[PDB]
Amino acid sequence: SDPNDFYRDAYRNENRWIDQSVFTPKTSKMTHYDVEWPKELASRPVTKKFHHDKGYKYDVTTPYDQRYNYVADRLGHPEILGNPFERLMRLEGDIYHPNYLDQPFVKVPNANPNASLNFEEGEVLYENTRLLEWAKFWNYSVVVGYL
């Protein structure tokens, strides 16, 4: 690993023509990159009507029915709806904004729980009712002390 010995041969004036020539090295072709990717890239849908000032030829929207469904959980997310108090108050929230909810590729979860779930009560697993009395005692005590 002597630096002078390596450099004196590696870099020479008479080899300038080939030293700074960019080329694609010969490597084994990979199907995912050299075969699959060009196919999918070339098969992209094309739209005649696209935003001329800012859009491109490949700005093709994915239909809503083709967007991936939400299957992470069954429980619904009513936050998307916007509670009646927020509606009555006329407050604008980002969580329940029509434009932001209309995600391009994935559907937002349904506000209502999945029909598979059954909400019939079963049997009690854990129960510590005295926490309510403790919570009331502490909360009132701090309020009185704070007042």
Partner 1 sequence: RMTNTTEEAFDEVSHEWQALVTSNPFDLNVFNYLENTQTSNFGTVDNPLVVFTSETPFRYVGCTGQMNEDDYEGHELLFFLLREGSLQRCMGCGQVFKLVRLRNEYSPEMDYYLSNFHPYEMQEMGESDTTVLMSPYKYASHYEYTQFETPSNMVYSMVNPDEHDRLLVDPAYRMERTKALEEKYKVYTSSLREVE
Partner 2 sequence: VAIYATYIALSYINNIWKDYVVRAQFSKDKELLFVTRVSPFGTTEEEVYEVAHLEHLPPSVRSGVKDLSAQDADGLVDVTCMSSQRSLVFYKGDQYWNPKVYNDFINQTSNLWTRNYTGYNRLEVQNSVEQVKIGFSHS
Partner 3 sequence: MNRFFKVSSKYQYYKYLEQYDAAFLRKYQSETHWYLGRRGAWKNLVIKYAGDHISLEEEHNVKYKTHLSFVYLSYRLAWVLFAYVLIYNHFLLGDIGKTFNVGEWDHRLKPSAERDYPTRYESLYILDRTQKW
Which residues are near partner 1 by CB under 8 A? 22-25, 62, 68, 70-72, 103-106
Of the two residues 91 and 117, which places its CB atom closer to partner 2 in the complex? 117
Binding-residue pattern over the window 13 to 52 for ligand CDL, x denoting contact by CB under 6 A: ----------------------------------------
Residue 25: which of ligand CDL, partner 1, partner 3, none does it interact with, CB under 5 to 8 A by kind? partner 1
Q: How far, in Å, are 39, 66, 74, 104 from residue 63 at the CA level?
A: 22, 5, 23, 9
CA angle 112, 114, 116 (to 5 degrees): 150
Give the tokens for residue 93: 């929230």
Pair 64, 107: CB distance under 8 Å? yes
The nearest distance, CB 93 to partner 3, in angstroms, is 5
The nearest distance, CB 29 to partner 1, in angstroms, is 16
Q: Contact between 70 and partner 3 (CB under 8 A)?
A: yes
Residue 86: which of partner 2, partner 3, ligand CDL, none does it interact with, CB under 5 to 8 A by kind? partner 3
Q: Report the alpha-carbon distance of residue 52 to residue 49 in Å, rounded.
A: 8
Q: Report the alpha-carbon distance of residue 38 to residue 146 in Å, rounded.
A: 69
Q: Report the alpha-carbon distance of residue 48 to residue 60 in Å, rounded.
A: 10
Q: Report the alpha-carbon distance of residue 71 to residue 109 in Å, rounded.
A: 8
Binding site residues, ligand CDL, CB under 6 A: 88-90
Binding site residues, partner 3, CB under 8 A: 70-74, 77, 86, 89-95, 97, 99-101, 103, 106, 108-109, 116
